[PDB]
Each structure stands twice: as structure tokens, then as C-alpha cells.
């Protein structure tokens, strides 16, 4: 995919985080840690250093991490991530 990206799907429950922290690096959103015991880890599809380009068609690149927190806090169901691997 664009910029050498990849598509991964992960299920999210209402009001339960996936288990991944994010930080801004320049204009990008980067996965800084995979929380042990969370859905993100068990999925084995999200990894530290991954850049998040899109989630459910929403462009994540260019967003402050606080806006990304807001978006995911109320998302649920099948989440479609567009990622650039580390």
C-alpha cells in the first residue's frame, strides 16, 4: 500500500482500549509500546515502531495523539489499520 503500508484488522470492544500507546513523531503517529495482556498484543498484528496512517478510513497521520485518543475511545467493532512497519 501507499508509503509501503499494510492492512491489519483488530477487534475492539466498547470502552476497552486495544492495549497500545501512541506518540507523535514529526507529523506522524507511532506505536510506542504494546501493552502486555491487551488485545493488541494477543492479536500479534500491532508492533512498536509501527506508524498509523489510517484507522477505519480516518487519516491518522497529521493528527495530535490526543485527537487519536478521542477517536479510538468511542470506536468499536472491526478496526482496519493502515500501518507502516518499523
Amino acid at each position: 500500500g501507499p508509503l509501503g503500508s499494510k492492512i491489519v484488522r483488530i477487534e475492539k470492544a466498547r470502552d476497552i482500549p486495544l492495549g497500545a500507546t501512541v506518540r507523535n513523531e514529526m507529523d506522524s503517529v507511532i506505536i510506542s509500546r504494546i501493552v502486555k495482556g491487551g488485545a493488541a498484543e494477543k492479536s500479534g498484528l500491532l508492533h512498536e515502531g509501527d506508524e498509523v496512517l489510517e484507522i477505519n478510513g480516518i487519516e491518522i497521520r497529521g493528527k495530535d495523539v490526543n485527537e487519536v485518543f478521542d477517536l479510538l475511545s468511542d470506536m468499536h467493532g472491526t478496526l482496519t489499520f493502515v500501518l507502516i512497519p518499523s
Binding site: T21, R23, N24, S32, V65, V68, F69
Partner: peptide, 7 residues
């Protein structure tokens, strides 16, 4: 300094 938010 860089903020790390949990999602």
C-alpha cells in the same frame, strides 16, 4: 518531551 497516550 513526548506524550504517550494509551488507546
Amino acid at each position: 518531551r513526548v506524550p504517550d497516550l494509551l488507546v
